[PDB]
Amino acid sequence: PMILGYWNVRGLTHPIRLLLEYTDSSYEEKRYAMGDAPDYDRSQWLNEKFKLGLDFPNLPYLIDGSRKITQSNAIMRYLARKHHLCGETEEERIRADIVENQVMDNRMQLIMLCYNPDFEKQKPEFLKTIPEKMKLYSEFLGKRPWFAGDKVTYVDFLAYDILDQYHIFEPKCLDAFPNLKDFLARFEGLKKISAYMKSSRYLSTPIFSKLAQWSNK
C-alpha cells in the first residue's frame, strides 16, 4: 500500500488523509509520537529521517510505489493528478492555485498565534480579523458548490480543513456566511467522507503538538 508519515496530530495533514479516503486509496499510516515535556523527544522520527530515501526529508511524506514525496501541497497535487481532481479549464486552475496558497497563509496565521507564549494576550485581536478572512472565502465561493467551479477538486479538501479549523477556534465565525456552513455540510456529506468520520482512523483533534497553547491535547 501507499504509506503516509506524519505526527499523531491533525496538524496540516487532514487534507491528505481525507483525500486518501475519498479516492479509496490503499494506504497505511505511520503516526510518529512526540515525547512529553520538558524533552518533547522527536527521536521516533529523527532516527529514520535520513533513512527513507526522501529528497528533502520532512513530515508529512508519502510513499507510493517508487515515488517518494514530501511537501503537503506537492502530496495533494500528486494525488489530484493521479485521480483527476485538478481544474479542467484555465479559470479553474487559477482559482485552485490561489486557494491552495491562501489556505497555507491562513494556516500559518493560526499556527503562529497558537504557538505564541502570549496567546491569551493575542486572542482577542486575532478574533477581530476572522470576519474579514471568512468574508473573502465567502465572496470567492459565492453560489458555486465547490471552490474551483462545477466539481470537487483537491482544493476543496484544503479549504474544508482550514474553515473547519477556524470554526473549532471560534464557533460563531461562519454564522454570517451561510454558503460556507453549507460548503462544510456538503463536503462532510460526500459518502466516503461521512464513513471516514465515524471510523477509528479519524483524527479530528488535537490539531497542534504538545507545545502549542491551544488544541495541544
Ligand X SMILES: N[C@@H](CCC(=O)N[C@@H](CS[C@@H]1c2ccccc2-c2ccccc2[C@H]1O)C(=O)NCC(=O)O)C(=O)O
Cα 195 to Cα 189: distance, rounded to the nearest angstrom: 9
| Residue 20: C-alpha distances to residues 1, 14, 153 (Å) | 11, 10, 13
* Residue 188 cell numbers, joined: 462532510
Residue with cell 456538503: 186
Sorted by sequence, the CB contacts under 8 Å of residue 182 that are 6+ apart come out as none
Beta strand 67-70 with 2-7 is unpaired
Nearest distance from C-beta of residue 143 to a second copy, angstroms: 15
Q: Could you tell me which residues are beta bridge partners of residue 64?
A: 67
Contact letters for a second copy, residues 5-24 (x by CB under 8 A): --------------------
Establish if 85 lies at the interface with a second copy (CB under 8 A): no
Q: Assess contact for 107 and 162: CB atoms under 8 A.
A: yes
**Cβ closest to ligand X, residue 162 vs residue 173:** 162
Q: Tell me which stretch binds ligand X (CB under 6 A): 7-15, 144-152, 168-176, 190-198.
A: 7-15
* Contact footprint for ligand X (CB under 6 A): 7, 9, 11-12, 49, 58-60, 71-73, 101, 105, 107, 111, 208-209
* Contact footprint for a second copy (CB under 8 A): 55-57, 67, 69-74, 77-78, 81, 90, 93-94, 97-98, 100-102, 105, 136, 139-140
Annotated binding site: 6-7, 42-45, 49, 58-59, 71-72, 115
